[model samples]
Target: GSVIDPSELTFVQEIGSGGLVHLGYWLNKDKVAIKTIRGAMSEEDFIEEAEVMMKLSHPKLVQLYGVCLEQAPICLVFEFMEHGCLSDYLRTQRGLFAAETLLGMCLDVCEGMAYLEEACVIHRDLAARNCLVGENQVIKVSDFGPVKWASPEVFSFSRYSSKSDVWSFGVLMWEVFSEGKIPYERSNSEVVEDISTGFRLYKPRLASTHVYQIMNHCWKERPEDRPAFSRLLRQLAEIAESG
Candidate 1:
């Protein structure tokens, strides 16, 4: 049932690039976003991604309706997010969101990441750009990639785990508070150098000191020192409830 027949989907229009995602109607009823895998990927990797996505069911994670693997180009059918990319949405709506709204967005991501952590899954890349905004301003994490949000261990040892994801989540918090500003004004190489020397991003004007403290906690030099997503979820929930 997880395998979708391409014939069952009516391609409506292309909505995104990179993977050439299309807005499609499934069986002429439900709307879905079908992302075609055009990048160089071995069959094994493709199958693995499909398996992982199919196994993961979460409200805060993008819902994978099915996969089209029996065709020439593989496709992943996902729930169509009404508002689209979170980063772009944040930019477009900058200076419009209340403090609690921004905090709630972070809480949503933290809850999703907590589920992934509990499920023993590591989201190698976690960022505002990789998340989608749905109806009622709900945020869902999607697409796994890496870069400026990478943890120190990921940079030096190529190690990835839930803790590393926590690091990225911190950067994501910054993105939310800053209304989707790029993490560092410097180049990637410059960021790597600065991060290696314990440089951290400055607090956004919108984020309270406590929120900045949470971000710093996630950026701890030692991965073990970083708070787990469960703890982070609790912290964010407390903040959201109080403010």
Candidate 2:
């Protein structure tokens, strides 16, 4: 509130809301993705999320460049990934994502998830929208609060836990395998319900056998039944070696 120049601020409210990654800017000639909290939310939730960001670090994960906790409006600043998300690239949908590309993406995600798990922090939400692709084609996971924080329906209330993050990892993998087509592309919540219930994507139609197996391994209905990020990392390594 006090440090940023009132006049130097650019793109005030430039981001449209769905998930609140509200402000982005070029700082000292390098781009930064700024995440801000809005609306009524518990202070504890923000603290937990900020702790998670500060704890986790990886190349394929968003860099926690700076944070302003002293201000009235709290915000986290991260390095910007150039090309946006995996789903954006796959949305072309005209051709299959090369097997190596899929493998690489899988590895990127594993690194992020593995670190989070080791720190006992669950990402809880690991969909395509939360991933970022760098100009050099590196991958990163972004956003950790709000969706898991501001959720307030009694019927919809689920306790915040890391096991939920496993579910989200599967969903993200499902999005990747679907060539970025969300499960409801053909319909609405019903389709999503059926698919999410079964942890299903277009698995029957996958082009490569190995990646197909890996996706299937991740999307298992039970979290314990699903493969851990370590196993996934090893599998990806094997695939890379074989290639």
Candidate 3:
């Protein structure tokens, strides 16, 4: 979480690219990943994210190496994930992995999320695309993309909490089981209308019964009704061990 001198960073090949930020290798023998943020981004916002990242350290969470803030658009350095984002990895490796392996990935994410919950931090966005895999199929949660904060309260009234992360975790589980299919095939309009009226995602094509049950529990209309990450982690561990 310390500042990285600009000279210490060497921009290598681009690893990821999209709106507002581009990811590349920070070459200097360390082989770390560097996030290049775009122009006009708020300094306070970047600092806040850096602080949050600094506070988080776990095997299932991406590690922040450092940051460079001397220039206009700063760079946040991170550990390199060989397998890339979860969505692309699953898409390419579909049917090659068993349900247990996929569920193990979910367990990895749950472990990281439980840590965040304990720290009172809201991930805001938890999805397959935001997850990374390391050696031995180890999946780690990464806050790489944008977000859809939370429930109607957060969208309309700006209230957000760990419960929001719980909801997204359910969606992430679906993504894992479905091999990266979009949660709702319908547009945002249809999603908002149908979801609020108790419309729910069906069991993923190959998901275990208990896995789907847990996902359903996460979709409860009231945030208070959703199981906490700690509980989810325990349940997932049991499922994995039983299998």
Tell me which residue pairs clash in candidate 1: none
Clashes of 2: 0
lDDT per residue (tens digit) for residues 1-243 in model 1: 488888998999998886688999999999899888775767667667767876778888887888787887878888999999999999999999888999999999988888889899888878888899999999998864145899988987899899999999999999999998988867778889898887899989999988999999999999999999999988888877776
Residue 42's lDDT in candidate 2: 61
For model 3, how big is the CA root-mean-square deviation?
A: 2.4
Clash number for every model?
0, 0, 0
Residue-level error in angstroms, candidate 3, position 235: 0.9
Order the candidates by lDDT, highest first. 1, 3, 2
- Identify the runs in model 3 with alpha carbons over 4 angstroms from their true place: 19-27, 144-158
lDDT, candidate 2, 86-144, per-residue tens: 77777864365666676677678878887777767656567777788887567888765
RMSD (Å) per prediction:
1.5, 5.0, 2.4
Worst 10 residues of 2 by lDDT: 146-155
Residue 172 CA displacement from its true place in model 2, Å: 1.7
Candidate 2 achieves a global lDDT of: 0.61
| Residue 56 lDDT in candidate 2 | 64
Clashing residue pairs, backbone N/CA/C < 3 A, model 2: none
What TM-score against the true fold does each predicted structure earn? 0.95, 0.74, 0.90
Q: How many clashes does the backbone of model 1 have? A: 0
Model 2's C-alpha root-mean-square deviation from the true structure amounts to 5.0
